[PDB]
Design a protein around this ligand. Structure first.
Ligand SMILES: COc1cc(C)c(S(=O)(=O)NC[C@@H](O)[C@@H](N)Cc2ccccc2)c(C)c1C
Ligand code: NA
Lengths: 29, 10, 251
């Protein structure tokens, strides 16, 4: 993959969380 | 419905 | 998207709009996987039963968007298409097996806060995350009910077990598909709907905190119906074809 893929400038790159991404993490049991 | 896009694109 | 919510700004920076030149209309969603390659569903470009067969010059891709209808000056970029590649074994006759297509842009698009590529999964990411119960995320500008959204919509939906997908429909389901959605018992709702197809089903890896595109919005029977599910093209299963196209025709 491209070196920087899947890392969002306005979220991961700045260490901000969007409002529902935690719902995804919590499903990954 | 859709706003006009610049003509250069069309 | 049915029963979703407004996307946040920059939440889905790989989301692409497939836009018809004349008349000016939203055809489908799509996704940015590099500076010159966009992934979508084959049926957004080719579906003979309904006389759909677009060529390169029929189409534009609009990247970096939030608003559906507005020209987002200084934010979106609009790209022309160099070449379309439809999977040679795309099955439009029966079940949309291999509902996948690549589009190469004429020039690279520049990345920004609003425009950024999603990752394509490796075997291990697929194995690890494509599990019943695990939730992915679907985004698009398609119908809100089986009107139309002002802005990009989003919904998180759980992957469903293969036997439940199959038992939901008379369509023959292949290994190149998976379904997702809540059960009627689960209470929560949500689905893709017309206009959303070709857009990405993404998951955030808990290992490296990156977003991977696991699926492409392919088909359903209605939208958000009880006991029915959204069907998605299985991206890792077709990755060899993706790599073969890019290696060969990419610079
Ligand atoms: C060819 O297999 C098909 C075709 C259609 C046209 C449909 S459908 O019932 O019409 N639903 C299509 C919608 O989901 C639409 N939003 C996506 C679409 C897919 C294929 C062709 C046109 C639209 C289905 C389920 C299958 C298995
Ligand atoms: Na459903």
């Amino acid at each position: 993959g491209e070196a920087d893929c899947g890392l969002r400038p306005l979220f991961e790159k700045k260490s901000l969380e969007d409002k529902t991404e935690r719902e995804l993490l919590e499903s990954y049991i | 419905d859709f706003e006009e896009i610049p003509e250069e694109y069309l | 998207i049915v029963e979703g919510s407004d996307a946040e700004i920059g939440m889905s920076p790989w989301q692409v709009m497939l836009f018809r030149k004349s008349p000016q209309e939203l055809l489908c969603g799509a996704s940015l996987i590099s500076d010159r390659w966009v992934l979508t569903a084959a049926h957004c470009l080719l579906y003979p039963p309904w006389d759909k067969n677009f060529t390169e010059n029929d189409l534009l891709v609009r990247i970096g968007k939030h608003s559906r209808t507005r020209y987002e000056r200084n934010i979106e970029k609009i790209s022309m298409l160099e070449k379309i590649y439809i999977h040679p074994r795309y099955n439009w006759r029966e079940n949309l097996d291999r509902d996948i297509a690549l589009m190469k842009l004429k020039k690279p698009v520049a990345f920004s806060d609003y425009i950024h590529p999603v990752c394509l999964p490796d075997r291990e990411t697929a194995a690890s995350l494509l599990q019943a119960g695990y939730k992915g995320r679907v985004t698009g500008w398609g119908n809100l009910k089986e009107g139309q959204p002002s802005v990009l919509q989003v919904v998180n939906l759980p992957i469903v077990e293969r036997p439940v997908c199959k038992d939901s429909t008379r369509i023959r389901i292949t290994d190149n598909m998976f379904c997702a959605g809540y059960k009627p018992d689960e209470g929560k709702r949500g689905d893709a709907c017309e206009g959303d197809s070709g857009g990405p089903f993404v998951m955030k890896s808990p290992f490296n905190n990156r977003w991977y595109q696991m699926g492409i919005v392919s088909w359903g029977e209605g939208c958000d119906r009880d006991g029915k599910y959204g069907f998605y093209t299985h991206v890792f299963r077709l990755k060899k074809w993706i790599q073969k196209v890019i290696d060969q025709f990419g610079e």
